Each structure stands twice: as C-alpha cells, then as structure tokens.
C-alpha cells in the first residue's frame, strides 16, 4: 500500500495569516490526491481533488499543490471556522488510503474562564451518588487548573474534566469538572468549593455553595 | 440533493457479526457506486470496500473473507455486513458516493454509525438537571450520566436552542458507563418566561428523555 | 495523533 506521512502532526496559527498542510507518499502517486476537512462530530468534507482542483461549495481561501510524493494543502487566509483536522488521501494504487491527519489550531488573545458551580440535584440524591459540577467557560488558553475542597479538605482523585473543541466563532475553550462522591461522604459535609486557576485571571477564582443553603 | 443516512450506532458482541443499511436519495443506486469506510483509533481512515452500480463488489485485502456487501436498488439501500468482530474493529463506519460514477473523491459521507465491539450490556442514561442559581447571564444544562455504549445525543428545546451550547466530550466512569454533561448560557431575565430542555435520546438503549432545567 | 471516538477528532 501507499503509506502517506502528513506533517506536522498539530498546526497553530493566528485568523488571517496563511497555513499550509504536508502530505508526503512513500512512492509516486502523479496528482492523484484529495484532501478532507472533518470538524467535531461530523464526516470527512471533500476540500480537494486531484492535487488542484476545485469543489462545488467550498470556499476559495482553500487550494492544492504538489505532484509526484510531496503535496500541500494551503489556507492563505485563516478563518476561525477552519478548525478542524485535515487528511490526505492517495489514490493512484489500490487500494486508495489516507494520511493520519494535521490538526489545526487557532490563535487568539488570552479570555478568561466564567466560572459556575452546580451542587447535585435532589433528583440524583435519590440513586445514592452526588455529582457536583464545576464550569469554567469560553476561556483561552486551552491550560486550566481546577481544585476541589470539601470543607477545606484537598479532593484528589475523585474528579474528571471534559473540555470542549475550539469555538468555531470566537476560538474559545469551555471546560467541564466533575465531583463525584457517594452520598454519605456528601450529607457528612458542608462547604463545596471549586477553585480556578488560569492565565486571564489576575487570583484564582473560588466559586462555592453550602449544602443546604 | 444528494444524501446517505445510515442505520443507528451501537453494540456488537465479541466474534459476532456487524450490520448497517445505508439508505441513499438524489441519486440512484444504477448510477453510481457505494463505499465504505471506516475510521478507528488505531488505523485512522480506512477504505473497506464498495459495491458498483451493476452489482459488482470490491473489498480491501484484509476485509475479503469477512465482508459482504449487497443492495436493493429499488429501496435504495445498501447492506453493510462484516463478521466476527473483535474490540480492534470498534469504529465509525461511513457510506460513501464519490463524485463520478467510477472514481473515489468522495464527495458526499454518511453521518456515520459508531460501532462499539463489547460483551457488556446496554444501558440508558439517567438525566439530572445542572440548576441555575453574574452579568445578568444564567448557566444551566443537563448531567447525562451512566450510560453504555456511546453515543448519547443533546439538543435544546427541540433544536431551537444552539447559541451558547457547550455539549461536552463523554468521559468514561471507572464502572465503565459513560457521562457527559451540556450546558448553556442564558438571560437571567428569560427564567421566568422561557423554558429550558435538554432532549436527550440514547439510541442503543432506546432511552428518549426529555429533561426540564428549573431554577431550584 | 489518535482519532478519538467520542469527539471525532485527532486527539494526541
């Protein structure tokens, strides 16, 4: 088979400014390429086709490049909406096959998190488990800290974070973090803090609710 | 236009065997051949094979003995079997029309059907409300937790609602069932008049859950 | 450099 090297593996870059995707084949494939776009939960969109040439709908900053084993994918004007990853795909051997993919990045100015606390439901209480939730969203950098304490006791271990792809409108982060307990550990307790550290706040952020009120 | 949709995502046992029915519009099936593909974690995008208009079928070298492909052109539909499944050949499938009759730039995709190679059972969600208790905006959403397997759907009021919607990955619990929360942001001053839902449907468990998110 | 189920993205 035609083995297709992509690079780099992650591509960062600013709205406006020009990106370009790499797509190496381990042998000759003529012009024989089609690149694909594919966003969060979605299929592979046909950018490219034939190295060059152009697709019904998809909009003119996208173009290609290349013949024999080095081919280019290029962006000469980044939009916030192009976030996605980017494969390559090879097919004048059978059987045709495709690159790993570039995932593309987005620069922008550093936005800090809005932070929301949300204790367990009475709902939840019935089935004998308490999850606390703790919010941080639409911030950037990607890179947060999320500290847990019940009744001043450091909580490690029982937590999970989820964090969202970029915003395909203003390149933002949101991320979720969850406290889980069993329901005895939550009626033994009063004060459930979740605290946030991040680059766009000048101390971190405590947001907190007494069991109860 | 021309469409693919593909049958419901969900579970096939160790060893056993995987069926999906792509249903095709805006094109018939005389005309034009269907591919498959997947995309794993451990190969990426991978091409298992086709069926051609007048019938003819090609599969990929290591899918030839365990895979059939066949169709209904008069139903427009093409069947996906594979057989004997193991946890490697957890995947999305896609369908797929290319462009031209005979070629492979593949134009138009299935959304897809997530296939999950597992001896563990089904199990639906419990859905339970995020309430809202800063700058006149409002954070709610929904905690969709305990389910198996992936994937789980979240909209807002029947798909009204989209701006301001964080649906976030699903993080798998260490009993392994899966959870997800989905937020949204809102005016603090439409609590009053608006109502929140989250719909939920977990289509492998036929769990179908509308969730409406009060302030407590 | 993984696709991810979930998120349908490349992920490490």
């Known amino acids: 088979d035609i083995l297709l090297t992509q690079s780099p593996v992650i591509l960062s870059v600013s709205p406006g400014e020009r990106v370009s995707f790499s797509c190496r084949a381990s042998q000759s494939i003529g012009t024989n390429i089609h690149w694909y776009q594919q966003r969060t939960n979605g299929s592979p969109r046909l950018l490219i086709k034939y190295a060059s040439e152009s697709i019904s709908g998809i909009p003119s900053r996208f173009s290609g490049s290349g013949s024999g084993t080095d081919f280019t994918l290029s962006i000469n004007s980044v939009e916030s909406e192009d976030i996605a990853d980017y494969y390559c795909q090879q097919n004048n051997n059978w059987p045709t096959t495709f ?79 969850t406290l889980t307990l069993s329901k005895a550990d939550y009626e033994k307790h009063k004060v459930y803090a979740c605290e946030v550290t991040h680059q766009g706040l000048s101390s971190p952020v405590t947001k907190s609710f007494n069991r109860g009120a | 236009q021309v469409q693919l949709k593909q049958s419901g995502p969900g579970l096939v046992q160790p060893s056993q065997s995987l069926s999906i029915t792509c249903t095709v519009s805006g094109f018939s099936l005389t ?76 134009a138009y995709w299935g959304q897809g059907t997530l296939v999950t190679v597992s001896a563990a059972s089904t199990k639906g969600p419990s859905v339970f409300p ?13 905690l969709v937790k305990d389910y198996f397997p992936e994937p789980v759907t979240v909209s807002w009021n029947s ?58 | 450099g993984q696709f991810d189920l979930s998120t349908r993205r490349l992920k490490g």
């Open chain 1, 99 to 177: 690159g790993a993919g570039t995932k593309l990045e987005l620069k922008r100015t550093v936005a800090a998190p809005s932070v929301f606390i949300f204790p367990p439901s009475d709902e939840q209480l019935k089935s004998g488990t308490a999850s606390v939730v703790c919010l941080l969203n639409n911030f950037y950098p990607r890179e947060a800290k999320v500290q847990w304490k019940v009744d001043n006791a450091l909580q490690s271990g029982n937590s999970q974070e989820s964090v969202t792809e970029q915003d395909s409108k203003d390149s933002t982060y949101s991320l979720s973090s």
């Open chain 2, 31 to 106: 005309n034009y051949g269907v591919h498959w593909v997947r995309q794993s974690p451990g190969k990426g995008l991978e091409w298992l094979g086709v069926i051609w208009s007048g019938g003819n079928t090609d599969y990929n070298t290591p899918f030839t003995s365990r895979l059939s492909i066949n169709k209904d052109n008069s139903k427009s539909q093409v069947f996906f079997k594979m057989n004997s499944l193991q946890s490697n050949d957890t995947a999305i499938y896609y369908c797929a029309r290319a462009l031209t009759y005979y070629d492979y730039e593949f």
């Open chain 2, 130 to 142: 995020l309430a809202p208790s800063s700058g006149g905006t409002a954070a709610l959403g929904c």
């Open chain 2, 159 to 216: 798909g009204a609602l989209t701006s301001g919607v964080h649906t976030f990955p699903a993080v798998l619990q260490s009993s392994g069932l899966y959870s997800l929360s989905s937020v949204v942001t809102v005016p603090s001053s439409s609590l009053g008049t608006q109502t929140y839902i989250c719909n939920v449907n977990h289509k492998p468990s036929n769990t179908k859950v509308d969730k409406r998110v009060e302030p407590k």
